[PDB]
Amino acid sequence: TNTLPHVAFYISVNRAISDEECTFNNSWLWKNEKGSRPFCKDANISLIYRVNLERSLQYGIVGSATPDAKIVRISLDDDSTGAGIHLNDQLGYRQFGASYTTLDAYFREWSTDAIAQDYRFVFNASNNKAQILKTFPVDNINEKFERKEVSGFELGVTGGVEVSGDGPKAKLEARASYTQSRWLTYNTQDYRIERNAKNAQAVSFTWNRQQYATAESLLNRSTDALWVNTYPVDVNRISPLSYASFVPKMDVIYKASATETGSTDFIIDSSVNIRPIYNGAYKHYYVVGAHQSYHGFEDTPRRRITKSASFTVDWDHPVFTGGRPVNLQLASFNNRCIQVDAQGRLTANMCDSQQSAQSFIYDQLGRYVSASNTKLCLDGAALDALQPCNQNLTQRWEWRKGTDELTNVYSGESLGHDKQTGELGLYASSNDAVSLRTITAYTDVFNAQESSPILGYTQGKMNQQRVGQDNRLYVRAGAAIDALGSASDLLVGGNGGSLSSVDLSGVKSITATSGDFQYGGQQLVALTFTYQDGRQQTVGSKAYVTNAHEDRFDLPDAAKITQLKIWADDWLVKGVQFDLN
Amino acid sequence: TNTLPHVAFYISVNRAISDEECTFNNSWLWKNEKGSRPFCKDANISLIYRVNLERSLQYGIVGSATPDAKIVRISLDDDSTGAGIHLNDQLGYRQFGASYTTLDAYFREWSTDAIAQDYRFVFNASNNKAQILKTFPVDNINEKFERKEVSGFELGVTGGVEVSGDGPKAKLEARASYTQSRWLTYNTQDYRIERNAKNAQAVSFTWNRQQYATAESLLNRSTDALWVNTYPVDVNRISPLSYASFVPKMDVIYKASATETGSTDFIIDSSVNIRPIYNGAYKHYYVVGAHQSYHGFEDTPRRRITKSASFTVDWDHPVFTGGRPVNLQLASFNNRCIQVDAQGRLTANMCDSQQSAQSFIYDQLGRYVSASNTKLCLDGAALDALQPCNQNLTQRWEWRKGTDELTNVYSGESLGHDKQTGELGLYASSNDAVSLRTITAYTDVFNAQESSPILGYTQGKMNQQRVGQDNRLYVRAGAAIDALGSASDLLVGGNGGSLSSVDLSGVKSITATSGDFQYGGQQLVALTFTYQDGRQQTVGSKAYVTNAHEDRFDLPDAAKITQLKIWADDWLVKGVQFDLN
Amino acid sequence: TNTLPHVAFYISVNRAISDEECTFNNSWLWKNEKGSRPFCKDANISLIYRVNLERSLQYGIVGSATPDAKIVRISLDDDSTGAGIHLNDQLGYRQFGASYTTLDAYFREWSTDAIAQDYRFVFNASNNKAQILKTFPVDNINEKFERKEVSGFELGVTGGVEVSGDGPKAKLEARASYTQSRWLTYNTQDYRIERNAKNAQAVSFTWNRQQYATAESLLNRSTDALWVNTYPVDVNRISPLSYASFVPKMDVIYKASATETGSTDFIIDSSVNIRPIYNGAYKHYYVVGAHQSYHGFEDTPRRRITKSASFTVDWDHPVFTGGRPVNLQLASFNNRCIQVDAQGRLTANMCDSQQSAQSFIYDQLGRYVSASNTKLCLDGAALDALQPCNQNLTQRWEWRKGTDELTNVYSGESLGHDKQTGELGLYASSNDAVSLRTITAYTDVFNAQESSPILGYTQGKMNQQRVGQDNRLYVRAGAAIDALGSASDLLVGGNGGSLSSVDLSGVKSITATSGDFQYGGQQLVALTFTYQDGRQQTVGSKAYVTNAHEDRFDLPDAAKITQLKIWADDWLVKGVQFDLN
């Protein structure tokens, strides 16, 4: 309670990966002939980010070497990571041959169970109120190299003596060599952490395969006699980090200005790039003889499975004052505290320790500054409302040691309240209608509001709309969701759908279906609303999509949907987020 | 007593391994001809895990950078590991030859005493109330590699002079070489710790052989003349870590939400993968000559012996308040404390320092919050029962310095109790019927309930059932245990056997028999109940099972079995835990 | 006096090794022809273990992250090791030749003074009340390896010009090489520390030769012309660690449950595996020429000399309360303290600061808890005996600041005692018969009882028996000791002896003789009792044993033998320990 306060919370990022999603052709050489299979067993993403919100300084601290700012920290580190990312328990392979006859072409293929070509994590601020301040790792590696430069020479002589029937021979010989080599030594990793600094609002970290990144590099045989039929891949070079378990560690820190206002959304795209491995053998025919040579095919298919989450930051949140607020409780009542409305008017309400509107920062001057609006202070000149903060002595308060009386610095009079109405005033002493007893305690204004699931994909331009007075969601749906909006003229997305309307009041849960759209790309194809009464309602179709995923959102008891966040291009909607309260 | 409280206990995991369990064919080449033996002497598993339960914060702490959460820690570390895992004191071998005559085939074999192909530890949460937060090791190794790239050239000249009878000769010669090599350097271990992140509830660590993982790799001879008969294995490459002693170290940490409720089971599967080693020699016949070449057989048999344990966490347990509770003792009596029932009604009972229902957390406001139910507080407005916690001044209490009187912040009156009934009230002063003397002390609500043994295996789905006051265990059983349950109509498991029934009153011991089932796989096959009266009773058959193991549960004097946990698939029962709770 | 208490003592392990014990054949090739000698000078074992006993927590500490447990620590470390193990001051050799004529066989041999093939330390709990919690070293080394993979090529051309009488010649030549190598790098030690985790009660550490473990590996010559006669061993590879001085360092830590009771014995077997070294030369005869080739013989004899010690832990010992006890001294008397008997009855005895029965732990409640029996407390409701501990206010005491008066929390009255009888009571004030003066001081209940020596060998199953009312040791002896016991029907051991009986009262010393039994294995062959009066008595024979050792036990003045510890198989006794008081 003397230290800097934080808002702190975890964001669980869980995403099971379907067998379909994990499925590819058994063959590259003979794509269509040899069929297909799942290339991973029970692939899954389970991460836990930790978020911190704080001011860069404690309230009222002056002349620090640390610039005043609003800070947002997102991290996976030693203290919190989650289970990790999994594709397989072990790696197997299947073999295939050409159905036809072969003189000089590819004749065998091995497709190996899939591994992660990369794991990737993308961080995005929704607007420019926030900029990236620093990250960990801080940057890409500036690699060091070791060069060797060698050179030398050799001088030799050889004396010879041959004796034979033909006669005696004798040789004296002399040599001189000059040698010169160049060495270069350097390091690589299984996975290299590649940082991408797109701009002030966006950065991404990709753990990308480096050593052994290609199918080619997994080969431990180059050539063979054609009677040889065996797996030419050293599966040992494929590390458990590539399929069994991967855990990222990174820190991203955004900053907003000391006076920033409004809100920003922060979006985290966690993903694995699933990559099956294809190698082939090639029958060589040259007249004299024939052999078999092994190869890796690199331009084979890959699939990126992504799970996204987002959280919202209100730059006006009490935590960004860097102060630790308290309340002022009118103690003639069992349960009444000073509370301030939007215009600053003061009333006496039942105390609620999480109500920012009952919270004040007691600053170095002895002012009681509203934690919800730091422009306003308790001013004894005018106790009907908070007044703009200034140097008025009437805005400064001191507690009478050993009592419950709060005195005003200017007049020395005490803060009193009406025993029945709780109306505030300054008094020299108590009387039958007024109590001088004020009680104060620290309040818990730092609790974090939970975040709605993103349903679908965070692709395309993102839009945001307040939910209308009529309390309805507007929809153009057909084979997929064409567009959404808060009113019929404010539709974000495409044009193609039949226009519909869904009632947002009484929704107990929403279930989105999305995936690879038959007609093109990745889209949000269906929403299903379930109400408190039990009735359901659906828009769009579950039938024009493969690699489908289902996102479910169970609304907390009696919460109302108030904001829409919609990801869409010009044709179709790609995802949506229904914000509460 | 100013610090965060923990629940802390050890879980002993002991499992003797039978000679049968340790037994394999003396030969791979000639499986059936050459017989079989135990491949290890007195193999055993003896580990000791340490468990900690705690809240992430202390009670009532606000604005910490640490997210509020419920924490479960499981570890084997520097401070506690247990004896370890043992297979043998030393490694020997036996030799075998083909009984038939041999021109071109395998003719000799050496089977070497078994080693641990891997040691493995699996952690599972029974439901999704808990997720993995972090582990140690945190992940698989992202291996670094050192590449060297070298290239050079050599320039040479040689001057020659030969003199012979035939005549004088002379040579001037010139050379030019160009060389180029590539180096790759990297590390391996005897055992590599492989992490498997199955999903948010499950993770596993496997110490897996890496260098020298194959029978092939143990070979220190490649070829020989056929008159050579000797062990082609360098037994030195087999480390004591592979048979004599192995001790894992790892940490697994689960988290539940700050408001999570109910219970979760945590299941730990410790295991060693016993692997005998087979190598063979091959007589080669080519017309010109003949030699012997050595080989390793890798697809030979292995057997995994497993010992499981589990513990239960009630998320409602006082430890997860992060508070240190005290009691309120009505001091006119020698031994009477305020106690709260399930509805919050207050009575005066004999003090029990381990009774959560007599424990309160005295918080920063001066409220006495029930440690068993933190939604309720001592409220002077209504001292017949605890009231929902709020900001009432009547819920705040201050001790009168240097006395035993507890005062109520609102009225200033003192907490008094009736000298005969212990009924609570607020009083300005004592009188002949009411005492104002209240005493308080910290209480020990952090003791850990001990956990029932898993009898059998923890495969399949796990069901939970209470045992009625009829204390009867219902049982369908054939050649194995088909199903179990606390009622005839509530059996869990398959449909197979003859219905039966067991008295659970006065059981001194329960002795499970499990193993490799004759009809197939691994199953629980028998249960022997032994009563204090001396009698025995059995269900299932000890006669349809190979590789048998007996799990024994010795019960406290006059304990009552209160719950059953049953692991079983659709066909049979795999295991059962008898909670004495 | 605010910290955790320990019991702490050293255990001296000294064992002189006899010339006989150190003696082997001068030759392996010609065992019987060439005689025998001592292969070490003044070999000796002198170690000092340090033992610590403690609770894992201090008394009454609650909610620690450390599990409550009883701890036993055995260690040889930086702070205590003893002199060490010694076999020789330097290493010499003797040479030997075949007495016969030799064309193609071994003809020379060198036997080198002996070295320690290994040093070994075995720790054993006598029962399962104690389990191994952790050790140092914690485990066997998981060795790291460095692999290099290299490959390259060379391209060359050579221009030639020869001029001779015969004519001018000229050559243009072209080359292409391809190279490929594999490197493996790793570490070894002179001695490797090999850990053997037999089970939860037993672990052992063996310092085992690794590099240079074989006679073969000591050879610095492979072949020679037969005129060469010299030592083919590089004696430099044999380290002083192998004969001159060896000092082990290890830590073994056992744990028992927080409520464990009774006793456990801890047995430490320190040993050196004495190994003479034999190498031989082999005359080779092939028609054309002849040479000499050198060899190491590995299956030569070794002898393990062992010295065992044991100590006993009573889990009921005050140290395991984790508290620091004090006494309550009735101060009207010059020397009288409250003392408690087995049933809890209180009497007033002459104070003895080492008497656990006069010791109390003054706990956080203000209870005086008996240190000898923590179930009982001083209770003012009934001062004739300690009462079962509970929350009674009458079990809580507070000292009146600045006086010698102890008051009872419940009534406020003071603890008084009768000036003549020391009978306790509660009083409002003193009077002519009762004193209120009580004095208290910390007591020394942590002294360690010394341990009796082990006679013979700690081999076979260990048995324990209370000595009978008749006070006699029963014996079946013949060529060796066949069996021992506390009564004629309670004989532990074999059958073969003539049954005898020895009086155990008035024994001043016992002298065991043991060694390599002529008929088989290692046995206890003779016991000799010497009495206070001077008379002697013997059982068994000193005449059927070689490599005999004599263990002597001089009993402290007027101590009575009360327990027997007997190591024996089914045939014969291997060792015995006579426990005192």
Number of helices of chain A: 0
Biggest chain-to-chain interface with counts: A-B, 83 and 66 residues
Overall, the morphology of chain A is: elongated
Number of strands of chain A: 43
Main sheet summary of chain A: 8 strands, antiparallel
Class from helix and strand fractions of chain A: mainly beta
Task: Indicate the radius of gyration of chain A in whole angstroms.
Answer: 35 Å
Give the name of the CATH superfamily of the largest domain in chain A. Answer: Leukocidin/porin MspA
> What is the CA–CA distance across the termini of chain A?
30 Å
Summarize this structure as a short list of keywords or feature phrases.
part of a larger assembly; 3 chains; 581 residues; mainly beta; Leukocidin-like; Porin MspA ribbon fold; Trefoil (Acidic Fibroblast Growth Factor, subunit A); 4 domains; eight-stranded antiparallel β-sheet
Description:
With 581 residues, chain A is mostly beta strands. Chain A has four domains: 272 residues, Leukocidin-like, CATH 2.70.240.10; 47 residues, Leukocidin/Hemolysin toxin, pre-stem domain (Porin MspA ribbon fold); 126 residues, Trefoil (Acidic Fibroblast Growth Factor, subunit A) (Trefoil); 136 residues, Vitelline Membrane Outer Layer Protein I, subunit A. In chain A, 0% of the residues lie in helices and 50% in strands. Chain A is built from no helices and 43 strands. In chain A, a hairpin with a 4-residue loop joins strand 38 and strand 39. The radius of gyration of chain A is 35 Å and the shape is elongated. Strand 11 of chain B pairs antiparallel with strand 10 of chain C, so a sheet runs across the interface.
